[PDB]
Design a protein around this ligand. Structure first.
Ligand code: SAM
Length: 197
């Protein structure tokens, strides 16, 4: 289940695999929001295939509409938007990504990261290949380096290598409206848990 314009269509494992073969790397942005972060990402890295996942199709309408245009007028070919929720990822995404990403999640995806939820998180790891990079940027440090958290994450397939506390400046490289509200909002701490699956 993917987004063509503001339309919902069907993509097979078949067609996905072809599209993918034309790119050196595949990247998943779970909880992608409005596609702006991905769009920026895709425009600069034409050798990475990008997949954004979000169950809320309406926030993607504008960019989904934009990526579908001609390349002369804003179109892109390295971007697909999947409409699925973290608690039921499509089978066609197993063992597919070189790097997975969960940026600024909220509601339940925030909790699945923070708690963490071993079962759901494990499905996210399942979307990843051999030694695929990962990245988790939450925001509301010592909690993330705890042993209970680090080992709750291993258990799911997520091996922590680095854990930085970040600030507003870091968030300026992102394009979503949400990320801008936070970048130029009040001073705040953003947390980044990166590593290999
Ligand atoms: C703050 S917006 C994310 C913004 C985008 N990731 C960014 O960094 O700008 C929160 C997003 O998380 C998504 N979300 C919350 N729970 C989710 C879940 N369980 N599975 C997938 N997406 C989820 C919502 O759909 C929403 O689009």
């Amino acid at each position: 289940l993917i987004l063509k314009g503001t339309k919902t269509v069907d993509l097979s494992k078949d067609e996905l695999t072809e599209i993918i073969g034309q790119f050196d790397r595949v990247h998943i942005d779970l909880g992608t929001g409005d596609g702006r972060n991905i769009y920026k990402l895709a425009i600069n890295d034409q050798n990475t295939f990008y997949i954004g996942i979000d169950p809320v199709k309406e926030n993607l309408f504008d960019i989904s509409k934009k990526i579908i245009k001609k390349p002369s007028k804003g179109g892109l070919s390295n971007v697909v938007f999947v409409i699925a929720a973290a608690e039921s990822l499509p089978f066609e995404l197993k063992n597919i990504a070189d790097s997975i990403s969960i940026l600024f999640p909220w509601g339940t995806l925030l909790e699945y990261v923070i708690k963490p939820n071993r079962d759901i998180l494990s499905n996210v790891a399942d979307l990843a290949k051999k030694e695929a990079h990962f990245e988790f940027v939450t925001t509301y440090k010592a909690y993330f380096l705890s042993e209970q958290y680090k080992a709750e994450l291993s258990n799911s397939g997520f091996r922590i290598d680095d854990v930085k506390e970040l600030d507003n400046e870091y968030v300026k490289q992102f394009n979503s409206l949400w990320a801008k509200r936070l970048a130029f909002g009040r001073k705040r701490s953003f947390f980044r848990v990166s590593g290999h699956v």
